[PDB]
Design a protein around this nucleic acid. Sequence first.
RNA 1: GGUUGCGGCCAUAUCUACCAGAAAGCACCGUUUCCCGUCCGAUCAACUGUAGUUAAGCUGGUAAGAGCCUGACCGAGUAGUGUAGUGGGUGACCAUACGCGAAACUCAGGUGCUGCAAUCU
Length: 172
Amino acid sequence: MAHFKEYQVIGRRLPTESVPEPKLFRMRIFASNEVIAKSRYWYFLQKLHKVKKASGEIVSINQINEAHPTKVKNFGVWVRYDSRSGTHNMYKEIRDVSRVAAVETLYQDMAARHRARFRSIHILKVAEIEKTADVKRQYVKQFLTKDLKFPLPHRVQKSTKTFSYKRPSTFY
RNA sequence: GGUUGCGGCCAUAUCUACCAGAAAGCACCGUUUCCCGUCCGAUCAACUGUAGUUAAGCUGGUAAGAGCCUGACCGAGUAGUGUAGUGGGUGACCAUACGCGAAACUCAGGUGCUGCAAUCU
Ligand SMILES: [Mg+2]
Ligand SMILES: [Mg+2]
């Protein structure tokens, strides 16, 4: 899984004599590949409608590419997750160039700060904030100030050799 | 279509309350010599369909009826459960993956169908 990928997954109940041409439900799924995306689709349709993989059918799966992969966006993400003692909703903000890597950042963030495994997370929503001043988290808001520039003090250079003859510097 | 005799399934047929029922049938209904049974022709027996009555039985209809029956992407793919992991959690327990999948509930509809023989504006 070099990264996540976003798939649109469209499926339906199996057609019957009573109801030919059912309703065609669709979701956007962040998954490492096609098989997981289809599995996640059925898992989530399990919780919304009376249907399972055996009574249903996957009409379409299509990868969804970022419209502008090279534009930095501020994403607001609503997640539902299970902690060890209950279920909680939260909203986080991630700044990056694509939805898939923003969601990838989000899973890493949920694992790091809340020990929430991919098993225990529901991506309720991902949406770009098209306007500044609608951004609310200070950790992403600090990066939107005009003419932003910071140094990177204490540069640590990687040495290929085991022994150095120079007693190095961390300048930058 | 009504009714009677014998039924099949055994409430969609049961229960409550209340209204209808032409004809025929069924019924209630008249009598106690006889065969029989009673504390008691109430029941059971016999006899006349004669004296009468649809009052009841019976049948059908009504009920935002009770019950019952059928369905529902109703609740609910919930509860539960087969399988898996060197999954989570101190534990109690829980999540996930591949499968199966209820009951209550909530609406909706319905309230006997039918076989054989005989008979009837
Ligand atoms: Mg008498
Ligand atoms: Mg094992």
